[PDB]
Design a protein around this nucleic acid. Sequence first.
RNA 1: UUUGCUCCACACAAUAUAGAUGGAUACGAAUAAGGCGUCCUUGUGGCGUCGCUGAACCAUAGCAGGCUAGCAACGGUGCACUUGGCGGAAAGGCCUUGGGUGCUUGCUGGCGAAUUGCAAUGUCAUUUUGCGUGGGGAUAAAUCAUUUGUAUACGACUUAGA
RNA 2: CCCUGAAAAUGGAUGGCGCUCAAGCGUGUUACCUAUACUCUACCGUCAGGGUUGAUAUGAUGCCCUGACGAGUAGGCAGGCGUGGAGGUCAGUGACGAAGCCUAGACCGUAAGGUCGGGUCGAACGGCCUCUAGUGCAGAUCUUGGUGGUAGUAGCAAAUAU
RNA 3: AACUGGCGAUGCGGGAUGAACCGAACGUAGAGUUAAGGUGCCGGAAUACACGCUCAUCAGACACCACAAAAGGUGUUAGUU
RNA 4: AAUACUGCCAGCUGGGACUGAGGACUGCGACGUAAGUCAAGGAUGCUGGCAUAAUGGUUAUAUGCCGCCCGUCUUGAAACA
RNA 5: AAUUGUUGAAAGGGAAGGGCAUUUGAUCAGACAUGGUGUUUUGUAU
Lengths: 51, 127, 50, 61, 172, 106, 197
Amino acid sequence: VLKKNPLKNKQVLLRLNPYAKVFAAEKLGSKKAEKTGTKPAAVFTETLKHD
Amino acid sequence: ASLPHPKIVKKHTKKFKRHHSDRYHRVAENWRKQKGIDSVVRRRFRGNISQPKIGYGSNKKTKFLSPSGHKTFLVANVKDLETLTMHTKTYAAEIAHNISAKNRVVILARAKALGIKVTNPKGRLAL
Amino acid sequence: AKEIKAERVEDQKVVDKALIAEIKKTPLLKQYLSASFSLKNGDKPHMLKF
Amino acid sequence: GIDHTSKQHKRSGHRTAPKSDNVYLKLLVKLYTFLARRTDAPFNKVVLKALFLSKINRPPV
Amino acid sequence: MAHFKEYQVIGRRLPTESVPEPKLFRMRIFASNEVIAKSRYWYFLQKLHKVKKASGEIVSINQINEAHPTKVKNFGVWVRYDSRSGTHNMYKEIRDVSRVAAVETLYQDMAARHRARFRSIHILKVAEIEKTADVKRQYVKQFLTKDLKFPLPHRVQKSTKTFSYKRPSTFY
Amino acid sequence: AESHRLYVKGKHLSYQRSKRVNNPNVSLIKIEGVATPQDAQFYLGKRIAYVYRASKEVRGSKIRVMWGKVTRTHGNSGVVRATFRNNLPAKTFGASVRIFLYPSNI
Amino acid sequence: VEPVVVIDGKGHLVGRLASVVAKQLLNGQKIVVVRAEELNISGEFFRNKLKYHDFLRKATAFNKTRGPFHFRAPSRIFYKALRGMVSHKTARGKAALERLKVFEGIPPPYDKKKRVVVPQALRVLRLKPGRKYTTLGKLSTSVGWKYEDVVAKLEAKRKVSSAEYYAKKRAFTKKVASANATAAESDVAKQLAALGY
RNA sequence: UUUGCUCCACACAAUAUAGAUGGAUACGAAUAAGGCGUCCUUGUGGCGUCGCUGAACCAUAGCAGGCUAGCAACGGUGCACUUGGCGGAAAGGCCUUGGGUGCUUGCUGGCGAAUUGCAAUGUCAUUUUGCGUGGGGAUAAAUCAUUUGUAUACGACUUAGA
RNA sequence: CCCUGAAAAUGGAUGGCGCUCAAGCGUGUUACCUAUACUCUACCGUCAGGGUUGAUAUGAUGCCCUGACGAGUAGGCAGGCGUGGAGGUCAGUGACGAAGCCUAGACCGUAAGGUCGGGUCGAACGGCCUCUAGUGCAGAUCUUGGUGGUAGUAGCAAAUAU
RNA sequence: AACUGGCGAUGCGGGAUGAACCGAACGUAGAGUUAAGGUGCCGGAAUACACGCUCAUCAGACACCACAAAAGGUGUUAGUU
RNA sequence: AAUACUGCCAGCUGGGACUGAGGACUGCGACGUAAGUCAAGGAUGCUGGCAUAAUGGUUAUAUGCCGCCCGUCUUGAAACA
RNA sequence: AAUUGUUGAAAGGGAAGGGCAUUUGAUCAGACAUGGUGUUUUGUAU
């Protein structure tokens, strides 16, 4: 009878999208990233910084 | 009283009087559409009267309902009032104007006997 | 056209007894509670805090 | 406002019930409406729609 | 759109079986965001080479941030524009803190003085003046003086109420 | 004391209006010394009473009152939109409404 | 914040004072504008005189007696300027113009009450130094105001009458500040100050 | 002209509201300068300080503001009285002598508050009359009508008449 | 940019007031104001697609569900309100008061209109189903009748004269 | 005359005002968000911020639109050789 | 290394406004071993005052804003048609 | 009915009339004050 809104009203947000509970539990939207010591090429950064 | 009903709202309580009905006396108050080619009432100019529209139609569940929540019913004789024996919560009695005083006392007596609310009980009171 | 219960009063007495005993230690608080509150002029309740 | 792609409030352009006043024709329509509503067979869906046809659209067979 | 960002936009012709890996042109564009960066890149590249966005592609768009974004530095900006009855070129010295702020001030001052909108201003080149003794504009040489000092007379204080009960002074 | 004001005064400025059309349903109120929307955000939901004097006693008081609430802020000057059970009479443009501190939030 | 305010008209620009006064009048404030002689109009004096003459020669042709009444007093000049800024024709505008009272110089009882200035309508805070200005005192005498000299003498007397008032107020303020210092550095003020005052 | 008129007092009713709900809290002049305090070899002076907001200063506690007791003292603040004054720009208000009186939260006590029940402005202001209770004060004019003409269509004007 | 070039006749128009580190010009940053626009909701109507009959609903052009739309002259169609008269029915109303008429009194309908109360009046008149038409007025320099402003006005001043 | 959109037949917000322009088309209401246009006051909305230019002894102020040219000015601000 | 900018969260939470549509249940789902509970196919719970001109209706008036005199011919009417 | 008088009400700074909303005055209907979760009929339907 009434269009309840997902993205709020967790009951509806779980009725649709059952993955929502796992998403909220394991924080899939706020997932920490790893670290890589990758450095951009000196040639590329020279092109960017030149002139 | 009646059965429970939704809140009553007219959605336009003000009457829709005809244009120029006060500027002229010959123009009766009864609504007539202004059907002229120049008329600002037809062209719906801001600041002029609003013509009746279907958008003002009252709620179906509260149509013909008096503020007391009953649909009116012109009763003329006692036999007519015997029609509403079990519908006291829906239709409210109402004595017709042409019912004589001596015939109104019997009808109001039968009205209180049958338990039907009457909306003109102080009409043509004999004193 | 138109007295207080004799049961309310002693409860009031025994409760404000404890409240008074607690409040006597801290300075100025009893007459602070006696004083009524009001808004002066030159006051800004949207930033005044209580 | 909406760009009316085609005419709005365009009626079906078909007959829902016979324009006739025949009570027995109204009874036949009352029956075949029940049949066309409650039976998958399209034979009811076609006989019911043919019961509304006018005199020229119901030639003698 | 005047809050600027420098972007380097690198782009090239569409690679072809006949000639692959086109020359991969590049330029520095002052723009409000990456979209205006793309647009200005193609505009300044149509005015230079036979290439259009249909016949070309954008290989990169990298925001350029200053090496010392908080160090005052003099800019010589060669700029052309389209005046009402013809075009012009000139060279404006600006004394700002970043190329972004320099081009911001430059468009703002061009619109203020020569009534030239963005649609008719092309920055030919913003070159940091490497050292002094060569800037040729008195309105900058006056700020290149030793012991740069000047006061600020007649300070106007913005008020909070419509009514003031003190006849405000203006010392500063 | 000699000051029993438990409300903050307010000038009922005008109806919510366009250049040439006003909406009587919504009134515009100005609080003294409130000139920024974040400051006027506190006054939202507060009760406003327009307390006016009638020529006669009606229900045991010569002083009648129209109740209302602060709906939302308005402009950058701390003016707030207000709404009443019955709209203001349009004669009170510049009259003193009272904005009480209830429903309190702090 | 104030029941009725008395606006000093000295050092104010006509239009920028009149706008804020017209807003405050409609908002239900009561304003009395004094010292309308020194009210300033930005720009050249001769240009202002020519503008006034442009306005002045503009009257109802068929009957001058009903045309735009070209007032010459500085108070009525400022009041005409404030009209037009107020929808004077309607009743609310009439009420606001009743709530307005403009006075040449400082008549009583506003002579013994605190005058106020509008900070952002001021000549000091609104005219870039160097731009010359026009003052209603000389403009009105150039256009027909035949009372500057007597206003001059009345203000000459009011300055001394208020000067002795301040002369004694300064002495009393000095003695009360000295008594404040005398009673200071006691506990009641010392821990009051750290308490907030 | 049912003892008329008016003013001071009190009450009672209305009607009356362009809008009370602590205090309009008073130099002037400049703003590329000023205010305040001190000082002096008094001036367009020296020194110091301040501003950068009124977010201030005053006031502000008490049954909507009771009753009552004491402590420290010669204050504050109403209310009137009075000494004098000063103020004409729309003065009608400001200062001040003195005494009486009420309150005093400057400090410490005690008693009371309730049931308007969980809010309903919870009324308190400023105007104007009109009947009244009781003191003072004075004891007319105008218009018509008649008449003159310095006036005049009529008005008006200008007259005169106990 | 500004200035000169730059002169039209009632007074006068950036809309006015006014505006000078603008309330002007150029440009940009945000914030904010408000259309009958857009979103959501309620309601009305139309349209479209549907649900609804094994002892279950007043028994269906009905009820209900869903969704979308709604500007509009000329014009078309549909549903209705109202007047005069006819057939039927309510064994309708009425001299204890029909019709008619007045009613800044009430209710219903979006509306056409209907109904009720009060006052006059005194003899016929209603609802529904259907039929029928000399069937609905604000205009036609409309017709007939009546009544106003103009207006207690113009005028009742040739013929000598009472 | 050609293409298209509108007015006619159309209200509504803005253009002070206007059949045609800008926005946007309309059942009755509520709440929010906006469009065009604006935000000193009239007038709802920042006498907000920022950079400059201009002083006019007829300033200028916003498209349609309600006015202006050639030429000239060690007036002033930028600039080119 | 931070912080700024942009972006993401099926992150939490504070305050405000308007609306409460429908009326046996079903359905989708969440939590709870389960029973059952529930923010899950639309508002209930408690409390208060009044019970009448208080709310409301009508009408008159004032105020704020708006509102040009209707019919017609006309591309265009408030027209000095 | 136009139109007029009297009375009563109100309003009136070069019109009047109208719309939206409210104030104010005047006036007007409605509730729920329900056979009511019953509680001995004074020789058992209040």
